[PDB]
Amino acid sequence: TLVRPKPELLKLLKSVGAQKDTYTMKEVLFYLGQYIMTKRLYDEKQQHIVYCSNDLLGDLFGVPSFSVKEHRKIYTMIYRNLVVV
Ligand SMILES: O=C(O)c1[nH]c2cc(Cl)ccc2c1-c1c(-c2ccccc2)ncn1Cc1ccc(Cl)cc1
């Protein structure tokens, strides 16, 4: 169960200190959430709405925001930026 992020997500994954170029999703999802945390994309008062508008992540995901409860939506959006080895 492995993927190669497409370059733009790979750059985003490296900005949160990823060292590889081919990951498990788990590792992808992990660095993503870390990115979300470290770029302050969450709303502290909505508590699981990620506001990715006006940020590389939103450009990758093609959406201004999403719930972390929408597992499929997010999986879909991630896989657009991936290539399964
Ligand atoms: O646990 C993680 O590493 C994690 N990684 C993520 C990546 C994204 Cl793109 C969205 C949510 C999470 C996410 C996450 C969060 C979260 C919420 C707000 C800020 C930071 C993290 N809450 C639960 N999760 C787990 C998770 C994993 C996959 C999916 Cl599809 C949804 C939620």
Curated annotation (Swiss-Prot):
- Summarize what the UniProt record says about post-translational modification: Phosphorylated at multiple sites near the RING domain by ATM upon DNA damage; this promotes its ubiquitination and degradation, preventing p53/TP53 degradation. Autoubiquitination leads to proteasomal degradation; resulting in p53/TP53 activation it may be regulated by SFN. Also ubiquitinated by TRIM13. ATM-phosphorylated MDM2 is ubiquitinated by the SCF(FBXO31) complex in response to genotoxic stress, promoting its degradation and p53/TP53-mediated DNA damage response. Deubiquitinated by USP2 leads to its accumulation and increases deubiquitination and degradation of p53/TP53. Deubiquitinated by USP7 leading to its stabilization.
Q: Where is this region: Necessary for interaction with USP2?
A: 1-85
In the induction comment, the record states: By DNA damage.
Give the signal peptide range: none
Annotated ranges, domain SWIB/MDM2: 1-84
Q: Where is this region: Sufficient to promote the mitochondrial pathway of apoptosis?
A: 1-76
Which superkingdom does the taxonomy of this entry point to?
A: Eukaryota
Indicate where this protein resides in the cell.
Nucleus, Nucleoplasm; Cytoplasm; Nucleus, Nucleolus; Nucleus
On tissue specificity, the annotation reads:
Ubiquitous. Isoform Mdm2-A, isoform Mdm2-B, isoform Mdm2-C, isoform Mdm2-D, isoform Mdm2-E, isoform Mdm2-F and isoform Mdm2-G are observed in a range of cancers but absent in normal tissues.
Q: How does it assemble?
A: Interacts with p53/TP53, TP73/p73, RBL5 and RP11. Binds specifically to RNA. Can interact with RB1, E1A-associated protein EP300 and the E2F1 transcription factor. Forms a ternary complex with p53/TP53 and WWOX. Interacts with CDKN2AIP, RFWD3, USP7, PYHIN1, and RBBP6. Interacts with ARRB1 and ARRB2. Interacts with PSMA3. Found in a trimeric complex with MDM2, MDM4 and USP2. Interacts with USP2 (via N-terminus and C-terminus). Interacts with MDM4. Part of a complex with MDM2, DAXX, RASSF1 and USP7. Part of a complex with DAXX, MDM2 and USP7. Interacts directly with DAXX and USP7.
Family, according to the entry, reads as follows:
Belongs to the MDM2/MDM4 family.
- Domain free text: Region I is sufficient for binding p53 and inhibiting its G1 arrest and apoptosis functions. It also binds p73 and E2F1. Region II contains most of a central acidic region required for interaction with ribosomal protein L5 and a putative C4-type zinc finger. The RING finger domain which coordinates two molecules of zinc interacts specifically with RNA whether or not zinc is present and mediates the heterooligomerization with MDM4. It is also essential for its ubiquitin ligase E3 activity toward p53 and itself.
Record's miscellaneous remark: MDM2 RING finger mutations that failed to ubiquitinate p53 in vitro did not target p53 for degradation when expressed in cells.
Q: Its biological function?
A: E3 ubiquitin-protein ligase that mediates ubiquitination of p53/TP53, leading to its degradation by the proteasome. Inhibits p53/TP53- and p73/TP73-mediated cell cycle arrest and apoptosis by binding its transcriptional activation domain. Also acts as a ubiquitin ligase E3 toward itself and ARRB1. Permits the nuclear export of p53/TP53. Promotes proteasome-dependent ubiquitin-independent degradation of retinoblastoma RB1 protein. Inhibits DAXX-mediated apoptosis by inducing its ubiquitination and degradation. Component of the TRIM28/KAP1-MDM2-p53/TP53 complex involved in stabilizing p53/TP53.
Task: Please state the pathology the record ties to this protein.
Answer: Seems to be amplified in certain tumors (including soft tissue sarcomas, osteosarcomas and gliomas). A higher frequency of splice variants lacking p53 binding domain sequences was found in late-stage and high-grade ovarian and bladder carcinomas. Four of the splice variants show loss of p53 binding. Lessel-Kubisch syndrome: An autosomal recessive progeroid syndrome characterized by short stature, pinched facial features, prematurely gray hair, scleroderma-like skin changes, small kidneys and consecutive kidney failure, followed by severe arterial hypertension.
Q: What is this protein called?
A: E3 ubiquitin-protein ligase Mdm2
Gene that specifies this protein: MDM2
The portion of the full protein included here is: 26 to 110 of 491
